[PDB]
């Protein structure tokens, strides 16, 4: 049985790895007081004597130089889970694939650019996926952080609107969808990916055709237009590269029924 | 769907070997102390009504979040109160309850060999104390929970999964450090491999409730005990040291006596045996 390191098993995605992956996997979710990825010695150690055949790096520079050169001696196999803010400087229009360049406008996007860089530089076997925003079922029993479905809900229930814009181009995704998916990767040869739904419609649209299904009144979700006014903020992911290799997410509005009549 | 078991504690030592275990025939539902906070009745009993446990895996320990041994004299109350809060949660749903006792429990008893669940305890310090205290007001609460007088535990000194320094990571240590380990003849103490506890517990769930002896035996004293898996490991004897001056007055004799248990049909190896096994099969 291959062993999987996951790093950051008590966030939203790393616990729902853990558990999908504990069925056919030997799974080591240290904590962040058991492996502090600013020693860069006790990094090399851990791993060095956990010997992950993959490494999961799901938490949020130091960190992930330390951990990626740890996983360079023992040619370990490393998912980044990334993020679809890398786009959000792009001025072009629609789903935007991975050979685009980007120049984020933030400190989130440039950090996740910036850590997936130095992961080519070291060891370029590593898969980084670029995720999108992420939710479970409003009524799961898992916990989870107040995500998407949530604070519709907390639109109707407190009664006030949820802001959103028509400037933004967003896909959301459902957890078990990148859960479900998440061993394909492992066999990708290395390089950036896009992972995650897609979307055609504003955050406005999305939003308003998902608060439908929730049978939360339209005028909950509010189009603030003078967000994003400068320049619109696409980050509408073209998974098409992910597709050639056999993953395949469901769009934004399709993905959440899915999910959400089951 | 597969029935649902809530671990609380899922990141301690006992909690994430159980959660991996679980997870596998079960669903396993693992909050952290931030989404179960067992100080708060309320919530407990909402969490515990919105996920439905048919089984509540206690681990009973303080995370250690919201105090270090720096205000150690609540934690014997909020310790009894989590779980006094989790009886009636799961008695709130016709729940079953496993909770983590001691064998420590069993440190005020003069007599000698190995001891029974029906035997008068008068514990010696606050955490023998604090579990057979949070024992019978659990099976106050809730008469169906079923306690475990747990051991101390270990993994494989190598093991993948991190753990804090418990025996045999202590007596390689002796062997690196040139410090001998300490120990005494006048304690009779059992040892149980982690695995051998977790791969059982299944088993404790159509178990009647009550308080049952839940780990290995042991007949030597833990000066031999040590030495003995200590020549296992080669580590010298000489690295582990007898301090004949602890429990010189009233021994401490917490080995227990699992008969209860194989009567239906769990079974435990003894210390050292279950220790010779688990270092092989690495």
Known sequence: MKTILVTGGSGFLGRRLVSHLSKNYTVVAPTHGELDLTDREKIISEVTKI?????????????????AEAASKINSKLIFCSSDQIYNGNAEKGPLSEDIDVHPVNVYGKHKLEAERKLQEILPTSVSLRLTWMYDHPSSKIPQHKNLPIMLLEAKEKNVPFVTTVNEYRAITFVGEVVENIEKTFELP????????????????????????????????????N????????????????????????????????????
């Open 227 to 262: 967000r994003f006014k400068a320049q619109a903020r696409n980050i509408s992911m073209n998974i098409q590269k992910i597709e050639k290799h056999g993953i395949h997410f469901s769009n934004t509005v399709d993905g959440f029924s899915k999910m959400y009549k089951s």
């Open 51 to 67: 010997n992950p055949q993959i490494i999961i790096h799901t938490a949020a520079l130091n960190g992930t130089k330390y951990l």
């Open 190 to 225: 290395g390089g950036v990916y896009n992972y995650g739904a897609s979307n055609t419609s504003n955050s406005y649209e999305t939003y308003k055709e998902i608060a439908k299904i929730m049978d939360v009144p339209e005028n909950l979700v509010e189009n603030d237009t």
